[PDB]
């Protein structure tokens, strides 16, 4: 019953953050470059089909 | 002419308040010996600062 004679203000929250990196010695034929090249091909095909 | 005119006034107070606040900040960094690392998790506000 005391809530009829009382007012409450409540705040709560949290933030999570991670930053991580990965270096690799590559060439133009390396897997890291090939995947990005193939991603661009799919981007062009998706544009063409709309 | 002799006399007096006077009076009193009053105010009643029954205020009552409480407050709590908690915070923990746990940032973690990595750096190499002889190097330096800086980290910011927040914002920026504009300030007028001219010669």
TrEMBL record, chain A:
<comment type="similarity">
    <text>Belongs to the bacterial secretin family.</text>
</comment>
<protein>
    <submittedName>
        <fullName>Type II and III secretion system protein</fullName>
    </submittedName>
</protein>
């Amino acid at each position: 019953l005391g809530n009829l004679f009382k007012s409450t203000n409540f705040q709560s929250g949290n933030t999570d953050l991670v930053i991580l990196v990965t270096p690799r010695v590559v060439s133009a034929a390396s897997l890291e470059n090939i995947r990005q090249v193939s991603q661009a091909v799919e981007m062009k095909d998706e544009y063409r089909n709309t | 002419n002799f006399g007096i005119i006077t009076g009193v006034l009053s105010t009643i107070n029954f205020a009552l308040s409480n407050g709590d606040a908690y915070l923990i900040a746990n940032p973690q960094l990595s750096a190499r010996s002889g190097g330096r690392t800086d980290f910011l998790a927040g914002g920026q506000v504009p300030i007028l600062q001219a010669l």
